[PDB]
Amino acid sequence: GETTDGVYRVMTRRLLGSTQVGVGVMQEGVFHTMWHVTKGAALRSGEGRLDPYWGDVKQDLVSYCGPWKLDAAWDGLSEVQLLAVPPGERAKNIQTLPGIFKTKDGDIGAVALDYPAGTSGSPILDKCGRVIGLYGNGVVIKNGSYVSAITQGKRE
Amino acid sequence: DMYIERAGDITWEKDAEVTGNSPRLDVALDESGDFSLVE
Numbered sequence: 001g002e003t004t005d006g007v008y009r010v011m012t013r014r015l016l017g018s019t020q021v022g023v024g025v026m027q028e029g030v031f032h033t034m035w036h037v038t039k040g041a042a043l044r045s046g047e048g049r050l051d052p053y054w055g056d057v058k059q060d061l062v063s064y065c066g067p068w069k070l071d072a073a074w075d076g077l078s079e080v081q082l083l084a085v086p087p088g089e090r091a092k093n094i095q096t097l098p099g100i101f102k103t104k105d106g107d108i109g110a111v112a113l114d115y116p117a118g119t120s121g122s123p124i125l126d127k128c129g130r131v132i133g134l135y136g137n138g139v140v141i142k143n144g145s146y147v148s149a150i151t152q153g154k155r156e
Numbered sequence: 157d158m159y160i161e162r163a164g165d166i167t168w169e170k171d172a173e174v175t176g177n178s179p180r181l182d183v184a185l186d187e188s189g190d191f192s193l194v195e
């Protein structure tokens with residue numbers, strides 16, 4: 001199927017009509033998404049099949065056709081862009097200054113933007129257009145608003 | 157049976173809409189990959 005680098009919707013026909021369950025990134029022949037979008041299932045791209053290659057429930061990430069390729073990191077100072085791909089809507093860039101998730105194992109950047117659950121897997125980018133993580137695993141804070149971690153894998 | 161469909165290039169866009177705050181939160185990450193607020 002289509003192997004061109006870029007952002008893709010992840011769809012299913014198992015529910016009513018065609019439903020967008022998430023989003024992912026094709027880079028260097030590998031498809032990258034969040035684990036909760038596919039649950040590790042195989043994917044179709046035209047007449048082609050993409051098989052899972054690596055995944056981890058705790059990181060909430062999965063790669064297909066090869067190892068995780070995304071290794072850019074948020075610099076901790078600059079604004080980033082969420083390349084949001086919402087269900088039934090055109091891809092749109094949103095610029096924001098990340099906040100921080102402070103954990104017992106270190107700090108992670110976080111983006112306070114609220115999109116439908118089917119937007120999970122949309123990439124967060126730096127000013128060079130490099131993907132610094134994927135949007136869609138986060139928390140609901142005091143005022144009821146959603147904040148997503150900037151989730152990034154490790155390139156072996 | 158899940159399938160993928162291209163939605164665009166990955167590029168920074170000049171003069172994109174700018175929004176969202178920058179909260180600093182204490183969080184915990186469990187073995188199931190769920191984040192929770194620590195208060």
Ligand SMILES: C[C@@H](CN)N1CCc2sccc2C1
Binds near residue numbers: 119135146
């Ligand atoms: C309304 C909140 C509730 N936690 N959520 C659901 C899960 C996801 S993944 C991307 C956006 C959202 C929005």
